Short mmCIF file of C-alpha atoms in Angstrom, two decimals:
data_model
loop_
_atom_site.label_atom_id
_atom_site.label_comp_id
_atom_site.label_asym_id
_atom_site.label_seq_id
_atom_site.Cartn_x
_atom_site.Cartn_y
_atom_site.Cartn_z
CA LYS A 1 -23.07 -40.12 -49.83
CA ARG A 2 -26.77 -39.83 -49.13
CA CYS A 3 -26.75 -36.20 -50.08
CA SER A 4 -24.48 -33.13 -50.66
CA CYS A 5 -24.65 -30.30 -48.14
CA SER A 6 -25.16 -26.66 -49.17
CA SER A 7 -22.88 -25.66 -46.32
CA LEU A 8 -19.86 -27.69 -45.45
CA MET A 9 -19.86 -25.98 -42.04
CA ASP A 10 -23.36 -27.41 -41.36
CA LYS A 11 -22.16 -30.31 -39.23
CA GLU A 12 -25.49 -32.01 -38.74
CA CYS A 13 -25.97 -32.03 -42.52
CA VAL A 14 -22.50 -33.43 -43.12
CA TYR A 15 -23.22 -36.21 -40.54
CA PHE A 16 -26.67 -37.01 -42.07
CA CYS A 17 -25.35 -36.93 -45.64
CA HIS A 18 -22.36 -39.13 -44.90
CA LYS B 1 -32.22 -25.92 -49.66
CA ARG B 2 -30.08 -27.56 -47.01
CA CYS B 3 -28.84 -30.35 -49.18
CA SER B 4 -29.25 -32.28 -52.44
CA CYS B 5 -30.48 -35.87 -52.19
CA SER B 6 -28.80 -38.74 -54.00
CA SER B 7 -32.22 -40.32 -54.48
CA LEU B 8 -35.49 -38.40 -54.50
CA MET B 9 -37.15 -41.68 -53.55
CA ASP B 10 -35.32 -41.38 -50.19
CA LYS B 11 -38.12 -39.46 -48.43
CA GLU B 12 -36.38 -38.81 -45.20
CA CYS B 13 -33.54 -37.24 -47.23
CA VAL B 14 -36.11 -35.04 -48.98
CA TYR B 15 -37.59 -33.91 -45.67
CA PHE B 16 -34.27 -33.14 -44.11
CA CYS B 17 -32.77 -31.46 -47.18
CA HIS B 18 -35.80 -29.54 -48.32
#
């Protein structure tokens, strides 16, 4: 992964980080 | 912060995550 999201419900973060 | 970056050299990750 590019990063680990603080909130797993933060879908844009999940998409960015994966 | 929004997320934790795998590399702090990855500046777009820093800007998105911080």
